[PDB]
Design a protein around this ligand. Structure first.
Ligand SMILES: CC(=O)N[C@H]1[C@@H](OP(=O)(O)OP(=O)(O)OC[C@H]2O[C@@H](n3ccc(=O)[nH]c3=O)[C@H](O)[C@@H]2O)O[C@H](CO)[C@@H](O)[C@@H]1O
Ligand SMILES: CC(=O)N[C@H]1[C@@H](OP(=O)(O)OP(=O)(O)OC[C@H]2O[C@@H](n3ccc(=O)[nH]c3=O)[C@H](O)[C@@H]2O)O[C@H](CO)[C@@H](O)[C@@H]1O
Ligand SMILES: CC(=O)N[C@H]1[C@@H](OP(=O)(O)OP(=O)(O)OC[C@H]2O[C@@H](n3ccc(=O)[nH]c3=O)[C@H](O)[C@@H]2O)O[C@H](CO)[C@@H](O)[C@@H]1O
Lengths: 326, 326, 326
């Protein structure tokens, strides 16, 4: 496991959110989208986390003040490659540089670790997915089964557009190699921007190998640009967590009407009825029964406690065998 | 945009509802199904709205008393054509007559306007949809790509039954032409009723042109005959509205657990948690936060107000920056 | 309708539930899974109900104390055939013996009755379903369209594994014939256990006929082994009941957010809003309106009563025309 840092590109506008709050700060389960990415980067072992931002550096820096982030300003939004070029001076030649988006909140550490493992030496580990309709996304080009480059939809021909495997945007490479390819990025293409994706053809040309890996679930690489798409991920997220809990032994009367917005520690034989929301750090002891519609926030509920329907439990530590409610 | 009136056929029984309330009066989002149709007719610009009813004229007339409807009694239920014949004497030869059903609540003004635009002169604008299983519905007959008539399922052969394009029942034509074809309607067919659908073959025979248009969504032409089907539309409706709101900038913690039953006016960055119900006319100022499970009814909530979970806000105007709840 | 008894095999471990409560005792709508099976057996007319258990006989016997069950201990879990062999001494030669699983809670009396009707004389009535992926399930073998036996996945070849029709495990036969085949069960196969499924080849060999019947819905033969699968059935169950109620004339504002956990008696034109839970025996008179999120438990609510949102009605009989709530 060679040392590694992570770069999060969170400099895009976020126009379709119609909000005075920077897009990547909007929450997915009570945690800003970008914090999800940052948490994933850190659990993965990132020695440094470079956050590339456009404006709102103040809102962003204030919100993310409790994180050891290296702030990298991308003055104008001239493409992913350009955003990467601003961060380059900070990559260490002795480490791998993994790149992530600040608006793709569900990327898992498991998938990123598999990406790290698939990155050949001097090569690029790329995360790709085969879509039914690949429209609008970078097409993966291959030659005798080997990745040779990425062609942006707008730059692709009608023939290349038929390619289904597309770029999720996440990739990893050695920092020295990264610096070198970044320096060679050109800006004349269908959109006059520096494409980080051009580094693929550049690595292939240098004779280096690009290995594509695939994500476990497609939602794991879904980017958010408006609230409708954020709500869809909130559901995928909530639902994925409800199932883990059911499988781990917590009875959810309806996993579709359960919301975990923080961290739940639970005992054995816990029962949670419908429309229950768990916020912040919550601990549920053994055989705790949560009535329908309760909101439990930053609390600790002792073993055998029963909480009646619609109770809000907040900032509390409840003694075992409690009966909270009529 | 030639002047136009609308006829709503709401005279059928409604037996499978098992209710002492006339079927078309049952609500879809707090509004009787037929009111939805009536509202759609009016927003479309209908100069007159003819409501064709069987019995319950009293319940119906009482309920819909605040509407300028022209009541047209259909003594016995002898088919859509017969119901139309009762309304005919009221069509003006100088206007288009659009026909709608009182139990197809989600027909959109957008689709109806496209129908109006597709109605050739002296011709008929018809709304049709291609179904996977067209069983039970009028089959659209064509000759060299042109609509020639409609054959009712029961009247169709095994060969014609294979036709997938069916009649949604909604159509528009000039009133003079309508009067004329209505007068020629016959009642000897598989069901001994006057079929309004026979006017299609009649218009084709007179050398006039029938143009079929399609609805944006299939739910838009779904008729309700029992509560199960009404509940399905309530969901399609609620869900369609939740998405509009998300796309317009209102954060819904779960668009699947949100119910708008009236009219919502909102500011920027409003947050609405799960299981919230909005009834009647509601106004939500900027950055208002609605806790899970609140019911907000005919209220105005000032900017920055926060409403705690499960609060019922009714008949109230709440001053800005209010904190309603523990 | 020849006399008949039922054997419920509920002796398996239940390891993936991670609970100190025997798996078949976990509730599906407030009723232990096995009680569902037992209720189905009794409504079907079972003269005796043999419950085959491994351990927890005490928890099980205590929980099911109000049922006239004949307890049959299966000392070690050596296969369905072995579990059946323990119960055999109790089958009467003059009755049919229907076999069910204690962890397949949604089997319907309708489907079981059709199974009884399809059981030839001296033959076996078998319940089978064609799956897309039949992996892990007993394959149904046929010869010229006739059932000849069942081959367990692990015992099947690659060719037999292609068979899609699988054994749901439910079957019925004469007790005398059952005793006889059970006595001949062998334990040398891919899993060294007594397979009740071997009785099929045994019945075919004796020249007797095996008739396969299919369940109305696949969920009806779904077995539960972990809480995630139990939650999925709770939803199928709740949803199936919500639709019956809608079709029977009760308006559910959202059949997806309705939970019946007991028995509901209702009048005409009852309205139940979202997130309502009905527990125990509940009676709703005519035109009762239940506000969103109410919990009604072992109560009787008189005609025309209106219950405000989030009210818990428990152990109460409410006089007609009551207004419970602000
Ligand atoms: C040239 C390139 O990289 N193309 C890929 C990129 O395209 P594409 O450039 O179209 O994607 P986006 O514009 O959404 O940008 C992706 C991410 O980069 C950030 N961003 C973008 C521009 C900028 O100047 N600064 C910045 O920080 C955004 O905030 C977002 O987090 O993502 C797609 C996945 O969604 C891939 O299928 C495309 O192959
Ligand atoms: C002959 C005819 O028109 N056939 C069409 C009609 O059939 P069909 O006659 O079978 O449809 P319905 O019986 O449901 O009636 C449709 C509408 O007309 C009303 N109504 C019906 C009979 C009556 O005497 N008075 C009255 O007002 C009903 O209340 C309902 O609003 O609708 C279908 C769509 O659902 C179309 O696919 C069929 O091609
Ligand atoms: C040999 C046999 O019967 N195979 C069938 C059985 O397999 P299979 O043996 O794999 O199924 P399970 O192990 O789940 O057991 C089925 C039922 O029998 C009970 N049980 C099992 C073993 C035991 O010693 N005692 C006992 O009581 C379980 O508690 C459960 O209620 O069910 C499948 C459906 O799920 C069928 O497709 C298989 O063809």
């Amino acid at each position: 496991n060679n040392a590694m840092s992570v770069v999060i590109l969170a400099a895009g506008k976020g126009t379709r959110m119609y909000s005075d709050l920077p897009k990547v700060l909007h929450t997915l389960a009570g945690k800003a989208m970008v914090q999800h990415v940052i948490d994933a980067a850190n659990e993965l072992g990132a020695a440094h986390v470079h956050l590339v931002y456009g404006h709102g550096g103040d809102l962003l820096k204030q919100a993310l003040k409790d994180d050891n982030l290296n702030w990298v300003l991308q003055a104008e939004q001239l493409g992913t490659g350009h955003a990467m070029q601003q961060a380059a001076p900070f990559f260490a030649d002795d480490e791998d540089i993994l790149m992530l988006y600040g608006d793709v909140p569900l990327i898992s550490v498991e998938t990123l670790q598999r990406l790290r493992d698939a990155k050949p030496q001097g090569g690029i580990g790329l995360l790709t997915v085969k879509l039914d309709d690949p429209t609008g996304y970078g097409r993966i080009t291959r030659e005798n089964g080997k990745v040779t480059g990425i062609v942006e939809h707008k730059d692709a021909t009608d023939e290349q557009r038929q390619i289904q495997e597309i770029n999720t945007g996440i990739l990893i490479a050695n920092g020295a190699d990264m610096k070198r390819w970044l320096a060679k990025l050109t800006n004349n293409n269908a959109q006059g921007e520096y494409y980080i994706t051009d580094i693929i053809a550049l690595a292939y040309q240098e004779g280096r190998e690009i290995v594509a890996v695939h994500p476990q679930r497609l939602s794991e690489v879904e980017g958010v640009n408006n609230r409708l798409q954020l709500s869809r991920l909130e559901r995928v997220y909530q639902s994925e967590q409800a199932e883990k809990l059911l499988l781990a032994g917590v009875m959810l009367r309806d996993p579709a009407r359960f919301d975990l917005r923080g961290t739940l520690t639970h005992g054995r034989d816990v029962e949670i009825d419908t429309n229950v929301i768990i916020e912040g750090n919550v601990t549920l002891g053994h055989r705790v029964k949560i009535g329908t519609g309760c909101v439990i926030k930053n609390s600790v509920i002792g073993d055998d406690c029963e909480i009646s329907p619609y109770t809000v439990v907040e900032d509390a530590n409840l003694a075992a065998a409690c009966t909270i409610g009529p």
